[PDB]
Amino acid sequence: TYMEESAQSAVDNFGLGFNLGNTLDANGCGTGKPVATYETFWGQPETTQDMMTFLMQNGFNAVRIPVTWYEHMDAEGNVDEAWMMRVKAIVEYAMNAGLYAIVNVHHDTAAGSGAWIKADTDVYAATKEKFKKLWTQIANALADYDQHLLFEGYNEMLDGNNSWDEPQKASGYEALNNYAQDFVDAVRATGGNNATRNLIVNTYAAAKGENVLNNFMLPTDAVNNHLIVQVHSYDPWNFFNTKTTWDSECHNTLTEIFSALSKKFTTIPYIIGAYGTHGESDISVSKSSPAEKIKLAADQAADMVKLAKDHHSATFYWMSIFDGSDRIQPQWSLPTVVEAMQEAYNN
Ligand SMILES: OC[C@H]1O[C@@H](O[C@H]2[C@H](O)[C@@H](O)[C@H](O[C@H]3[C@H](O)[C@@H](O)[C@H](O[C@H]4[C@H](O)[C@@H](O)[C@H](O)O[C@@H]4CO)O[C@@H]3CO)O[C@@H]2CO)[C@H](O)[C@@H](O)[C@@H]1O
Ligand SMILES: [Ca+2]
Ligand SMILES: [Ca+2]
Numbered sequence: 001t002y003m004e005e006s007a008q009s010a011v012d013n014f015g016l017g018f019n020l021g022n023t024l025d026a027n028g029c030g031t032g033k034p035v036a037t038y039e040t041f042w043g044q045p046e047t048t049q050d051m052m053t054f055l056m057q058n059g060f061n062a063v064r065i066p067v068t069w070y071e072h073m074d075a076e077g078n079v080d081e082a083w084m085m086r087v088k089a090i091v092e093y094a095m096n097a098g099l100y101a102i103v104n105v106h107h108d109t110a111a112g113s114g115a116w117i118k119a120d121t122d123v124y125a126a127t128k129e130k131f132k133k134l135w136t137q138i139a140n141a142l143a144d145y146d147q148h149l150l151f152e153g154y155n156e157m158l159d160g161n162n163s164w165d166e167p168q169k170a171s172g173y174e175a176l177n178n179y180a181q182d183f184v185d186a187v188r189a190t191g192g193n194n195a196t197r198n199l200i201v202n203t204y205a206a207a208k209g210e211n212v213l214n215n216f217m218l219p220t221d222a223v224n225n226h227l228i229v230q231v232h233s234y235d236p237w238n239f240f241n242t243k244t245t246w247d248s249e250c251h252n253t254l255t256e257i258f259s260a261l262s263k264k265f266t267t268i269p270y271i272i273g274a275y276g277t278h279g280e281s282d283i284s285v286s287k288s289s290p291a292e293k294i295k296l297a298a299d300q301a302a303d304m305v306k307l308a309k310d311h312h313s314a315t316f317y318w319m320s321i322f323d324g325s326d327r328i329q330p331q332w333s334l335p336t337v338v339e340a341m342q343e344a345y346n347n
Contacts, residue, residue: 002193005147006225010198011269015061017316025066025106035086047090052097054330059342062100064316068107070114077133084141104152111162119172120160135186143192152200153183173215181219198226206232213264230273238279246299258311276318298340305344
């Protein structure tokens with residue numbers, strides 16, 4: 001049964017969140033393959049009900065489900081039925097487990113080959129109707145799920161130069177803001193539960209610098225309080241390689257980030273939709289990292305979780321805590337990181 005819930009209520013209920021990363025967002029094997037060829041292409045197992053059940057069983061209340069779509073669309077932009085069914089299936093696993101879930105449009109943005117959604121007015125002109133047709137299909141396919149399911153328009157939209165901090169042209173922000181409006185428009189048009197479903201729109205690059213926040217424009221929505229803004233955080237950049245301890249620089253960096261976010265968005269809720277130790281040369285923590293580096297990861301995660309709580313936000317860990325063959329067991333990959341998160345959330 002669908003029960004309308006405000007965006008802030010949803011965020012307040014997300015609790016500890018997790019990203020099912022490098023899974024349905026994996027891509028690159030080409031078209032015309034069985035669904036599992038995509039889902040396992042970046043070294044994750046096929047997702048099962050047990051994995052979602054495990055998250056709920058262990059103190060997590062929300063899961064972000066990244067999805068990359070471009071190899072699953074025909075020339076007209078129609079989504080392959082096998083692919084849409086699998087997205088539906090993993091969504092249902094999360095719903096069954098009692099979790100909140102987010103479905104997005106993932107490596108259709110950013111620097112990967114195949115990205116086609118870009119913060120560039122010419123790219124926007126060429127792709128706007130394709131983007132709306134995609135969201136119309138996703139919204140229709142997922143329409144009957146209750147308010148625990150949210151839609152996120154796009155992941156990490158960059159300009160045509162893949163500029164990670166800010167677009168090289170100010171009009172890049174216009175394009176982004178227009179995509180965000182088109183996403184909301186297309187979803188709302190499908191009606192039913194989607195008339196009041198909570199929707200998530202991301203900043204440029206999911207970044208949070210002064211210019212990016214000042215040039216973000218929240219879409220107009222005919223219903224009240226059903227929009228959430230999302231940013232990501234791997235800050236201070238490359239700390240996993242340069243630091244042995246989560247020190248005052250690290251702490252102050254995060255406190256200042258949340259201060260800036262809360263002063264920008266006031267009444268509009270926001271989330272940290274992805275965070276972790278991922279730094280230069282995409283190095284990140286694993287269970288074979290030195291103990292000191294695992295502690296560094298735990299301290300980051302605890303700080304992120306408690307600061308988000310203080311700021312009426314919520315957080316979603318990018319991958320590392322529940323990874324690879326550990327998902328099959330199911331067991332945590334990084335139990336000390338999770339213990340720190342749990343302490344931070346429940347106090
Ligand atoms: O380079 C490709 C790589 O980019 C990754 O994203 C990185 C950016 O590259 C990097 O420039 C960015 O650096 C942050 C830095 O970590 C923050 O500590 C610093 O913080 C400010 C904040 O911007 C202010 O809003 C706030 O008020 O104060 C704090 C503290 O002074 O801001 C800079 C950016 O200006 O970090 C990004 C990661 O978060 C991508 O993640 C990766 O995928 C790409 O390959
Ligand atoms: Ca196909
Ligand atoms: Ca607020």
